[PDB]
């Protein structure tokens, strides 16, 4: 790491890609553990 | 001119090696010139890590050829896959990976130039080299042992697979015959 | 030859938590340097809250295996199965009481930017000291260090208990007896 | 379980094997992890 | 002639395991129209170890190209007079790239 | 301290430092304080081990019952080698727990022997001065003050004796175990070992 | 050093430098030191080899047992050539291990015989001053101080005698081996050589 590499990792596209990857992973793992849910 | 005191038909015109004696055991041995394209500190850290890993690996290879824990009823050449299926290699990978993530942060701070000499984690609990006069001598002993253990482990695995025997790792005619024979030899052993 | 190294890991540069005056700051254990990013007071409050919850959790995990309430609707001395065996209204009321307690214990002091606005709220001090141990001021430091170390130990302990129950399917001391069985 | 030193020996001796007969080059290669052994290079990429 | 080529398998998470069709040979996967199978058969790659080692060599060459790209912009960047040697570039491409690639591939 | 100013020496090696391999010549003083502490701990452990192994070999057992259902003589029916495995597991765990507590307490004593303390000198009360830990004031070494009637010279002489007996007992207990494991190695070790 | 001021000379080749091929004139001083060291090592090896080969040819063996199950006379039941193959491989490996240690420690000494040392002057204690290794102070050459009663002139005369006997011993051991391998070459070897 560095004081300026973390600033690059703090940019909008890198953070957007990382957060969308985390959200997609969380939803995919929820679908893996709790599949085919229509009602609550 | 300053020729390299390990090849000496070639100079130390590999000036990426730096000043003479900056590292212990510096005999100017860089024929292929890896220091021209890579930093010296990172290469030194890789070298010392390889030295320590190969020392532990050589000792473990021989010890597993001799003794083992109860329940680990596996030979040395098949311990890898058997303990992977058992699950202990996952624990080894996890804990060694934690220590190596810490080492990664250490190398990142060292290459940016915090304070670190390569391979120095301060791990001297017994205080062998707390005397600064004996620091420079034990570094060379550590190096030479590590290099010899690298070669030793390579020979260990290659002769263990090639022949198929325990700790001597020798053929049948080298232990059940005569190697210092002076009679007229045949055409096979 | 690091000029200012960490007290815990001497091969690393000193983390910003070492410069803080909080209890336990003498050891510089922060290899990932999360004290550089997270506020130290907020992280200390979170650490103390997790520690206290884990002390109560470890004690309850131990006591649930042996003892029981006198005729509870579904005991099942296995705390992973016990949370599904017990009525859900009990959990609803317990979580509601905890929600009330921590809604009122800091009336507007949620979030990182609003909690430690007053420079008199030290982290982890919710004012809960009825017996007035904290009016001594000689054993205040040793009690703070005892609370912090016991909280961290209880965190690690409760994680171990939970995952041991996961890998065994049995409570803690039954699994421990099966470890030290005979062969 | 078998805790070493407590309800078990500390170090069980490994079974000793006599020395003989460099087997073949085509024997250990056809069961290795990278070269040949198409059922074992399919056994290297993880278990979990 | 009866086994359909397939080199791409999907993960069953959401019901998408229906895409793992019956391509033949006791295998389930998505059918491949790239023609890489016939390209490998034209090279004599009948074993599945040689494909793995070709992949490893490709990874090594990709790392080599990454290092060369860093090296020629940050360490040893050629001057303008180097690029303008179009006769030398033309000779070297026409012989060493094309003719030697044809010669080595014919071998 | 420096290896020259220690109490090892001895008339068996003539009155000089024995070290033939120069172990202390390649290491620091902080290493040789650890060496002295480890040597004295090894000597004391092996002195107790040699006496206990001789007692077990002579089939001398306590009159009574080790665990309810298990006699002392039932455990000591075989040799001392087949005696540690016949101890109940709870007893082995309690012995190891007591040794654990003793080692932790003796190491947590203040001036460590690698930072100013005397190597091999164990604190008299290892479980004293620890807050939230009350133990009686039984001394670990020398509870009944035998080494209070001795002067400095008698204490130095008996320390030299302790070092010599510790080394001899280390060789003896290794001889006992090796003679049991490999028959005919120690020829003085007849059958009952 | 220079080939002129060396101790070979001898009255057999008149009293001048024998060298007919001009080896010593084409090479520098360092090669002459190497040649003298190799000549003296060759002569000493050949002297020991000649004495041992004559002892083996006379069927003289030690009273006892070489390996358990293998008598000295059982190995010596044939000629000296078919005795080296009857020695167990472990014993020959131990002999070569001692020889390897001696050669390594001899060459590891300082002022190498090219770089200042005397060629052929092997010092008395090759295993002295080595860290991590200890040996008694038995000298390699003259464990008994036989050449301490001699003067300088007697030492020079006996060095000349050593060189002459070394050359004769090389001729002799090569004659023995060639006579065994090619019978009828050396007529002085009846059958048992
Ligand atoms: C931090 C502590 C810790 C813990 C809790 C574990 C837990 C485990 N390890 Mg393990 N391991 C660790 C550190 C740890 N590891 C480290 C640092 C290394 C070296 C890098 C390894 C190397 C390793 C290998 C090579 C193997 C394991 C295996 C195992 C499993 C054993 C399963 C079983 O039947 O138990 C067996 C139980 C016993 C034998 C009873 C005695 C064990 C005692 C009670 C442990 C003492 C407490 C322990 C040190 C916790 C720390 C306490 C703290 C105060 C320091 C289990 C998941 C094995 C595995 O995966 O098999 C499934 C295996 O083969 N581990
Ligand atoms: C909580 C579980 C537990 C317990 C109570 C013991 C208890 C014991 N083990 Mg042990 N052991 C364990 C887990 C355990 N082990 C595990 C998980 C492994 C696998 C890594 C081993 C591997 C092992 C070996 C290889 C040996 C023992 C030995 C011993 C005995 C002597 C201890 C000694 O000399 O230490 C002395 C004190 C130290 C070495 C200080 C270090 C303390 C820890 C290790 C750090 C003792 C009865 C020895 C034996 O059989 O002797 C009878 C022996 O040779 N153990
Ligand atoms: C015989 C010599 C030779 C060869 C083989 C090449 C080959 C190449 N040059 Mg090049 N070049 C040469 C001389 C040569 N040049 C000279 C003398 C000049 C100066 C006048 C230049 C100036 C130049 C510029 C300015 C550029 C190139 C580029 C390229 C690449 C074109 C892309 C392509 O076709 O991908 C084909 C890909 C491959 C064949 C993969 C192999 C890649 C390696 C590096 C090829 C050489 C391998 C080795 C020598 C053979 C070992 C054989 C061994 C296995 C036995 C290609 C790798 C362009 C490029 O892509 O830059 C990176 C580009 O911009 N060259
Ligand atoms: C492991 C136990 C141990 C340890 C730590 C020491 C440590 C020490 N001894 Mg000591 N000693 C021991 C066992 C031990 N001794 C035994 C068993 C004997 C009787 C033979 C002696 C006899 C002895 C004498 C006569 C003297 C010392 C002296 C010293 C001190 C300086 C020498 C030194 O650097 O040693 C460092 C030692 C080690 C690092 C131990 C390495 C052991 C290796 C790993 C194993 C080699 C043993 C080998 C396998 C043979 C085993 C079979 C055995 C039964 C014979 C030092 C404090 C000298 C002293 O105090 O001077 C003031 C001195 O004069 N010792
Ligand atoms: C004065 C004591 C003494 C004597 C006379 C012998 C005598 C002998 N030992 Mg011995 N030995 C001793 C102490 C002694 N040992 C000690 C203290 C140890 C432990 C370090 C050993 C370990 C030992 C081994 C490991 C071996 C011998 C062997 C031998 C025999 C050669 C011979 C009978 C060898 C033998 O023939 O064993 C049957 C053998 O392999 N000994
Ligand atoms: C390999 C053994 C060996 C070596 C290294 C030497 C070395 C030396 N001898 Mg020497 N010598 C030897 C054997 C050896 N000798 C034998 C066996 C005899 C008896 C015939 C002599 C008789 C002898 C005399 C009389 C004198 C020397 C002298 C010298 C020194 C100067 C000559 C020189 O530079 O030649 C260097 C020699 C070599 C590089 C060896 C080359 C050998 C070739 C490669 C093989 C030829 C062998 C040939 C085929 C015969 C083999 C069969 C044989 C059994 C008959 C030099 C230090 C002179 C001296 O000391 O003056 C100061 C001197 O006056 N030597
Ligand atoms: C298991 C493998 C192993 C291990 C752990 C070591 C460990 C060590 N070697 Mg080493 N070495 C090995 C194999 C090994 N070596 C092999 C195969 C070779 C090639 C022959 C070498 C050649 C070598 C050289 C040339 C040197 C070392 C040195 C050292 C020491 C470095 C610093 C030091 O303590 O100096 C301080 C030295 C000591 C404290 C010496 C004490 C060591 C004694 C001999 C222990 C007694 C062991 C005992 C006899 C049991 C062994 C049984 C075995 C013979 C079957 C260190 C203890 C250096 C050194 O200084 O050591 C002399 C050194 O100069 N080694
Ligand atoms: C119990 C005892 C304990 C120890 C006590 C002390 C021990 C003493 C100690 O060991 O010292 C050993 C020692 C010494 C010493 C001294 O230091 C002492 C002791 C006292 C001190 O003041 C003086 C000195 C001296 C320094 C010397 C050694 C010299 C040697 C070995 C020279 C060896 C020399 C072998 C040769 C020439 C072999 C020749 C082979 C030949 C000629 C072969 C042949 C033949 C024949 C077959 C014969 C015939 C044939 O014929 C045809 C065909 O024509 C020709 C040929 C060539 O084919
Ligand atoms: C103040 C002072 O001075 O302190 C004193 C203390 C003290 C005690 C009074 C002293 C003393 C006196 C005494 C009695 C000292 C006694 C020393 C004693 C009795 C030491 C036995 C060694 C036995 C060994 C090494 C066995 C090796 C056995 C070996 C190496 C093997 O056979 C191994 C091997 O078989 C395997 C395992 C497998 C095979 O494939 C390979 C081989 C064959 C190689 C001292 C020394 O004077 C110093
Ligand atoms: C101080 C001083 O002066 O030093 C002294 C030292 C010393 C020892 C005292 C001296 C002496 C005296 C002595 C005793 C000198 C002895 C000299 C001696 C006894 C020299 C034998 C040679 C035998 C040979 C060459 C055999 C050839 C063998 C040959 C060429 C073959 O038949 C080989 C061959 O059949 C094969 C193998 C097959 C095919 O390839 C074909 C051929 C045919 C080619 C000196 C000389 O006075 C000098």
What does this protein look like?
- This is part of a larger assembly, with one copy of chain A (40 residues), one copy of chain B (189 residues), one copy of chain C (183 residues), one copy of chain D (48 residues), one copy of chain E (107 residues) and two copies of chain F (193 residues).
- In chain A, 68% of the residues lie in helices and 0% in strands.
- Chain A has two helices and no strands.
- The longest helix of chain A is centred in the middle third of the chain and has 22 residues, at 12-33.
- Chain A starts with a helix and ends in a 7-residue tail after the last helix.
- Chain B has helices spanning 40-66, 79-86, 88-111, 135-163, 172-175; one strand at 67-68.
- In chain B, α1 (40-66) packs across α4 (135-163).
- By secondary structure, chain D is largely without helices or strands.
- Chain D contains one helix and one strand.
- The two termini of chain D are 25 Å apart.
- With 193 residues, chain F is mainly α.
- Chain F contains four helices and two strands, in the order αββααα.
- Chain F has helices at residues 29-57, 72-75, 89-107, 152-181, and strands at residues 65-67, 70-71.
- In chain F, strands 1-2 form a two-stranded antiparallel sheet.
- In chain F, α1 crosses α4.
- The longest helix of chain F is centred in the C-terminal third of the chain and has 30 residues, at 152-181.
- Chains in contact: A-E, B-C, B-D, B-F, B-G, C-D, D-E, F-G.
- Chain A binds chain E through residues 28, 31-32, 35-36, and chain E through 13-15.
- β1 (67-68) of chain B pairs antiparallel with β1 (12-13) of chain D, so a sheet runs across the interface.
- It is classed as photosynthesis.
- Keywords: PSI-FCPI supercomplex, photosynthesis.
- The entry is titled "Structural insights into the PSI-FCPI supercomplex from the coccolithophore Emiliania huxleyi".
